[PDB]
């Protein structure tokens, strides 16, 4: 898919790391601050485990930019780098699916 204005970042988080509100907030800001180097970030979605179940999209990080070009630059600037020693893998998301907030 793509290019589009929504970026999906994979291989960065363990569900365990998303249970504590303090640690969850730290990860979101970490993502925002780095993605903001490339564009204005309109939204960030990081699905969290609920009732001890990995909900659709848990494990993934979604970031929406104001333009396709800004999303493209962020994909180039972030893909293949390390986040908590893990190689970052990326794909474009369908803004429609993101507009529905349907993750998988």
């Amino acid at each position: 898919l793509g290019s589009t204005e929504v970026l999906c970042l994979m291989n960065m988080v363990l569900p365990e790391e998303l249970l504590d509100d303090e640690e969850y907030e730290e990860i979101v800001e970490d993502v925002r601050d780095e993605c903001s180097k490339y564009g204005l970030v309109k939204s960030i979605e990081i699905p969290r485990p609920v009732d001890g179940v990995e909900v659709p999209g848990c494990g993934k990080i979604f970031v929406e930019f104001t333009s396709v070009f800004d999303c493209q630059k962020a994909m180039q600037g972030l893909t293949g780098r390390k986040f908590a020693n893990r190689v970052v893998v990326t794909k474009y998301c369908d803004p429609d699916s993101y507009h529905r907030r349907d993750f998988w």
């Binding site: 970490d30 601050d33 600037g77 972030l78 893909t79 780098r81 390390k82 986040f83 908590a84």
Partner: peptide, 12 residues
């Protein structure tokens, strides 16, 4: 105290 490495993508 970011979890991001400093290394540019072009250098990976």
């Amino acid at each position: 105290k970011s979890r991001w490495d400093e290394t540019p993508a072009s250098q990976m």
